[PDB]
Design an enzyme around this catalytic site. Structure first.
Site, PDB file in Angstrom:
ATOM      1  N   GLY A 138      -7.679 -15.529 -16.818  1.00 47.07           N
ATOM      2  CA  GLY A 138      -6.923 -14.680 -15.911  1.00 47.07           C
ATOM      3  C   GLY A 138      -5.495 -14.525 -16.388  1.00 47.07           C
ATOM      4  O   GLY A 138      -5.042 -15.206 -17.313  1.00 47.07           O
ATOM      5  N   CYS A 177       1.760 -13.777 -13.164  1.00 47.93           N
ATOM      6  CA  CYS A 177       3.111 -13.278 -13.402  1.00 47.93           C
ATOM      7  C   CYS A 177       3.873 -14.166 -14.376  1.00 47.93           C
ATOM      8  O   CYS A 177       4.779 -13.688 -15.072  1.00 47.93           O
ATOM      9  CB  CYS A 177       3.875 -13.152 -12.081  1.00 47.93           C
ATOM     10  SG  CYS A 177       3.616 -14.495 -10.893  1.00 47.93           S
ATOM     11  N   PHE A 178       3.514 -15.448 -14.453  1.00 51.25           N
ATOM     12  CA  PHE A 178       4.191 -16.388 -15.332  1.00 51.25           C
ATOM     13  C   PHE A 178       3.446 -16.642 -16.634  1.00 51.25           C
ATOM     14  O   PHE A 178       3.979 -17.338 -17.502  1.00 51.25           O
ATOM     15  CB  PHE A 178       4.420 -17.715 -14.600  1.00 51.25           C
ATOM     16  CG  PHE A 178       5.272 -17.583 -13.370  1.00 51.25           C
ATOM     17  CD1 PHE A 178       6.465 -16.877 -13.410  1.00 51.25           C
ATOM     18  CD2 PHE A 178       4.876 -18.152 -12.171  1.00 51.25           C
ATOM     19  CE1 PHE A 178       7.254 -16.754 -12.278  1.00 51.25           C
ATOM     20  CE2 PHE A 178       5.656 -18.029 -11.034  1.00 51.25           C
ATOM     21  CZ  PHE A 178       6.849 -17.331 -11.087  1.00 51.25           C
ATOM     22  N   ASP A 228      -0.717 -16.768 -18.758  1.00 49.85           N
ATOM     23  CA  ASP A 228      -2.165 -16.646 -18.836  1.00 49.85           C
ATOM     24  C   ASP A 228      -2.826 -17.997 -18.605  1.00 49.85           C
ATOM     25  O   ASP A 228      -2.183 -19.043 -18.651  1.00 49.85           O
ATOM     26  CB  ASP A 228      -2.600 -16.091 -20.199  1.00 49.85           C
ATOM     27  CG  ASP A 228      -2.318 -14.619 -20.340  1.00 49.85           C
ATOM     28  OD1 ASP A 228      -1.739 -14.048 -19.397  1.00 49.85           O
ATOM     29  OD2 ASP A 228      -2.681 -14.031 -21.384  1.00 49.85           O
ATOM     30  N   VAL A 229      -4.131 -17.968 -18.357  1.00 48.90           N
ATOM     31  CA  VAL A 229      -4.953 -19.173 -18.359  1.00 48.90           C
ATOM     32  C   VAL A 229      -6.163 -18.910 -19.246  1.00 48.90           C
ATOM     33  O   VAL A 229      -6.786 -17.850 -19.152  1.00 48.90           O
ATOM     34  CB  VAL A 229      -5.387 -19.591 -16.940  1.00 48.90           C
ATOM     35  CG1 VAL A 229      -6.162 -20.902 -16.992  1.00 48.90           C
ATOM     36  CG2 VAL A 229      -4.174 -19.715 -16.014  1.00 48.90           C
ATOM     37  N   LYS A 252      -3.128 -23.431 -19.462  1.00 48.07           N
ATOM     38  CA  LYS A 252      -2.210 -22.472 -18.866  1.00 48.07           C
ATOM     39  C   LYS A 252      -1.046 -22.269 -19.825  1.00 48.07           C
ATOM     40  O   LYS A 252      -0.425 -23.236 -20.270  1.00 48.07           O
ATOM     41  CB  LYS A 252      -1.709 -22.946 -17.500  1.00 48.07           C
ATOM     42  CG  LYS A 252      -0.496 -22.186 -16.985  1.00 48.07           C
ATOM     43  CD  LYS A 252      -0.239 -22.455 -15.506  1.00 48.07           C
ATOM     44  CE  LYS A 252      -1.269 -21.721 -14.657  1.00 48.07           C
ATOM     45  NZ  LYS A 252      -0.908 -21.545 -13.214  1.00 48.07           N
ATOM     46  N   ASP A 281       4.473 -25.019  -4.097  1.00 48.65           N
ATOM     47  CA  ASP A 281       3.681 -23.817  -4.349  1.00 48.65           C
ATOM     48  C   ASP A 281       2.243 -24.039  -3.878  1.00 48.65           C
ATOM     49  O   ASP A 281       1.279 -23.659  -4.554  1.00 48.65           O
ATOM     50  CB  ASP A 281       3.722 -23.439  -5.834  1.00 48.65           C
ATOM     51  CG  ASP A 281       3.274 -22.013  -6.103  1.00 48.65           C
ATOM     52  OD1 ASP A 281       2.950 -21.275  -5.151  1.00 48.65           O
ATOM     53  OD2 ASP A 281       3.251 -21.629  -7.288  1.00 48.65           O
TER      54      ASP A 281
HETATM   55  C1  LIG Z   1      -8.931 -12.726  -9.934  1.00 43.94           C
HETATM   56  N1  LIG Z   1      -8.728 -13.969 -10.202  1.00 43.94           N
HETATM   57  C2  LIG Z   1      -8.979 -14.221 -11.534  1.00 43.94           C
HETATM   58  C3  LIG Z   1      -8.701 -15.688 -11.917  1.00 43.94           C
HETATM   59  N2  LIG Z   1      -7.467 -16.115 -11.548  1.00 43.94           N
HETATM   60  C4  LIG Z   1      -7.348 -17.419 -11.682  1.00 43.94           C
HETATM   61  C5  LIG Z   1      -7.368 -17.600 -13.219  1.00 43.94           C
HETATM   62  C6  LIG Z   1      -7.168 -19.079 -13.647  1.00 43.94           C
HETATM   63  C7  LIG Z   1      -8.174 -19.998 -12.920  1.00 43.94           C
HETATM   64  N3  LIG Z   1      -7.705 -21.335 -13.429  1.00 43.94           N
HETATM   65  C8  LIG Z   1      -6.442 -21.776 -13.441  1.00 43.94           C
HETATM   66  C9  LIG Z   1      -6.431 -23.088 -13.939  1.00 43.94           C
HETATM   67  C10 LIG Z   1      -5.239 -23.857 -14.150  1.00 43.94           C
HETATM   68  C11 LIG Z   1      -5.050 -24.464 -15.404  1.00 43.94           C
HETATM   69  C12 LIG Z   1      -3.876 -25.200 -15.658  1.00 43.94           C
HETATM   70  C13 LIG Z   1      -2.887 -25.322 -14.668  1.00 43.94           C
HETATM   71  O1  LIG Z   1      -1.692 -26.065 -15.018  1.00 43.94           O
HETATM   72  C14 LIG Z   1      -1.130 -26.980 -14.107  1.00 43.94           C
HETATM   73  C15 LIG Z   1      -1.914 -27.920 -13.433  1.00 43.94           C
HETATM   74  C16 LIG Z   1      -1.303 -28.821 -12.572  1.00 43.94           C
HETATM   75  C17 LIG Z   1       0.084 -28.791 -12.393  1.00 43.94           C
HETATM   76  C18 LIG Z   1       0.866 -27.854 -13.083  1.00 43.94           C
HETATM   77  C19 LIG Z   1       0.265 -26.959 -13.941  1.00 43.94           C
HETATM   78  C20 LIG Z   1      -3.051 -24.691 -13.422  1.00 43.94           C
HETATM   79  C21 LIG Z   1      -4.235 -23.953 -13.170  1.00 43.94           C
HETATM   80  C22 LIG Z   1      -7.790 -23.417 -14.237  1.00 43.94           C
HETATM   81  C23 LIG Z   1      -8.492 -24.521 -14.747  1.00 43.94           C
HETATM   82  N4  LIG Z   1      -7.844 -25.733 -15.152  1.00 43.94           N
HETATM   83  N5  LIG Z   1      -9.819 -24.458 -14.875  1.00 43.94           N
HETATM   84  C24 LIG Z   1     -10.495 -23.356 -14.518  1.00 43.94           C
HETATM   85  N6  LIG Z   1      -9.892 -22.303 -14.040  1.00 43.94           N
HETATM   86  C25 LIG Z   1      -8.540 -22.295 -13.887  1.00 43.94           C
HETATM   87  C26 LIG Z   1      -8.145 -19.796 -11.404  1.00 43.94           C
HETATM   88  C27 LIG Z   1      -8.371 -18.340 -10.992  1.00 43.94           C
HETATM   89  C28 LIG Z   1      -7.201 -15.818 -10.212  1.00 43.94           C
HETATM   90  C29 LIG Z   1      -7.474 -14.357  -9.828  1.00 43.94           C
END
Ligand SMILES: CN1CCN([C@H]2CC[C@H](n3cc(-c4ccc(Oc5ccccc5)cc4)c4c(N)ncnc43)CC2)CC1
Ligand SMILES: [Cl-]
Length: 448
Positions: A191, A194-195, A197-198, A212, A303
């Site tokens: 996905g 704004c800050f 990609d993941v 991330k 957040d």
């Molecule tokens: C339409 N959608 C499409 C997908 N979008 C998102 C895209 C990323 C998805 N997502 C995000 C994450 C994810 C990864 C790292 C992260 O970094 C931090 C963690 C703790 C503290 C500080 C930073 C934070 C989040 C994620 C994941 N680990 N494993 C699997 N999926 C993951 C969650 C949904 C959201 C909107």
């Protein structure tokens, strides 16, 4: 001094060992708690191993049915998942009696339906562990072995050890936190935010990770590193596990991969739409448990919202994206000075006077509750962000969402009090949400 592997493990570097469940080791170095130097008794070779994959041979920690310091509620979540038949059981440490244990077993009756019963395993001061004083044993192991061979007065035979989720190492490798960008391979974009990609990808071409990535200019790499040193210390089942970071821009935050993505997306797809109210309240309770851990640590999320909760195996919820909003820099398009915050989720004193506390996170948690009970609805529907700030400053808060029980909404209103000291603690919210439906159960089964 002799240890045995509980799980299989494949080497990821050239310094660690590959071993099989049942393989035994001598432990040589334990300076890092997460990875130990060890010599295999099978091969005679020496290398490091994840310390949470081994246990002293013959000890209770090496038993498949022993789950250590898991909670009662977590034990119920684990036992009531698919693949556990009637009579699935585990042993854990007691939450209410120091030095005692608890036997948790999956059962069924007409009143409670499909549920878990808990039995107190006490210890006589003179000697002997027992469920019923009629039968006593030298060790909890012998007690379990007996109740696995004959149903001596329990709700069932101890039929099978409770199934466990896929084990994970604490860190990608020994003494490894800051890694080079070249060690990561970005494979599939999950996905865009704004800050940044993941991505789904790998580390050392072997270990599946999520990454991330932050756009350049989002935050100081040095400030990021100093805050990641603190985040590294946070460790709890309901927080997403940080593996590693890359500090050079663009910043990488490398974590475990959550196979169902965000809670917000999960609640909108068919599986989440099929969710019943008890499951929703249990996920809320999981988030409250993680936040109560952060409260004990006095670590402020800033957040907290459904897009920053991740759903994994067995629909386990984990909290993501904590702490870092504090470090997000300014731009010329947003009048928010210093710390950025999600407008619709942020308490009035935090949004207006910069007072971020655990109580502002409590407010956020109330907003997340509205997100969760409605299965993904936008907060304050019909209002833009400026209107929301103006009205919550004047004491407006959201009305009861459609399909929300009265008690849950009373809790939300408690989290939205203007005086932050009048809002409940996360400890209280966790207790309330865990006991929300199981209000009349007796704690432990009376059994003579
Ligand atoms: C339409 N959608 C499409 C997908 N979008 C998102 C895209 C990323 C998805 N997502 C995000 C994450 C994810 C990864 C790292 C992260 O970094 C931090 C963690 C703790 C503290 C500080 C930073 C934070 C989040 C994620 C994941 N680990 N494993 C699997 N999926 C993951 C969650 C949904 C959201 C909107
Ligand atoms: Cl892992």
């Amino acid at each position: 001094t002799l240890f045995i592997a509980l799980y299989d493990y494949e080497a990821r570097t050239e310094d660690d060992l590959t071993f099989t469940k049942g393989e035994k080791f001598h432990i040589l170095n334990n300076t890092e708690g997460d990875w130990w130097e060890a010599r295999s008794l099978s091969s005679g070779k020496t290398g490091c191993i994840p310390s949470n994959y081994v246990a002293p041979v013959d000890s209770i920690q090496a038993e498949e049915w022993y789950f250590g310091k898991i909670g009662r509620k977590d034990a119920e979540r684990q036992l009531l998942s698919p693949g556990n038949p009637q009579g699935a059981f585990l042993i854990r440490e007691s939450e209410t009696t120091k030095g005692a244990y608890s036997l948790s077993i999956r059962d069924w009756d007409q009143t409670r339906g499909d549920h878990v019963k808990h039995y107190k395993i006490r210890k006589l001061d003179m000697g002997g562990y027992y469920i019923t004083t009629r039968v006593q044993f030298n060790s909890v192991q012998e007690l379990v072995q007996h109740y696995m061979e004959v149903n001596d007065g329990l709700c069932n035979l101890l039929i099978a050890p409770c199934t466990i989720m896929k084990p994970q190492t604490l860190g990608l490798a020994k003494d490894a936190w800051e890694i080079s960008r070249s060690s990561i391979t970005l494979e599939r974009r999950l996905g865009t935010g704004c800050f940044g990609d993941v991505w789904l990808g790998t580390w050392n071409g072997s270990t599946k990770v999520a990454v991330k990535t932050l756009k350049p200019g989002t935050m100081s790499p040095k400030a990021f590193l100093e805050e990641a040193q603190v985040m590294k210390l946070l460790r709890h089942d309901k927080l997403v596990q940080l593996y590693a970071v890359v500090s050079e821009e663009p910043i990488y935050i490398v974590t475990e991969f959550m196979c169902h993505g965000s809670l917000l997306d999960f609640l909108k797809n068919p599986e989440g739409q099929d969710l019943r109210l008890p499951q929703l309240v249990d996920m809320a309770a999981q988030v409250a448990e993680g936040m109560a851990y952060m409260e004990r640590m006095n670590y402020i999320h800033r957040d907290l919202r459904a897009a920053n909760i991740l759903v994994g195996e067995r629909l386990a919820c984990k909290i993501a994206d904590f702490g870092l909003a504090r470090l997000i820099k300014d731009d010329e398009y947003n009048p928010c000075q210093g710390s950025k915050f999600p407008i619709k989720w942020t308490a009035p004193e935090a949004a207006l006077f910069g007072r971020f506390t655990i109580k502002s996170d409590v407010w956020s948690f109330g907003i997340l509750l509205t997100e969760l009970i409605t299965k993904g609805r936008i907060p304050y529907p019909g209002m833009n962000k400026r209107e929301v700030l103006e009205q919550v400053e004047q004491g407006y808060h959201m009305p009861c969402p459609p399909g929300c029980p009265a008690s849950l909404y009373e809790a939300m209103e408690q989290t939205w009090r203007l005086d932050p000291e009048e809002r409940p603690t996360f400890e209280y919210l966790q207790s309330f949400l865990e006991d929300y439906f199981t209000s009349a159960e007796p704690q432990y089964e009376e059994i003579p």
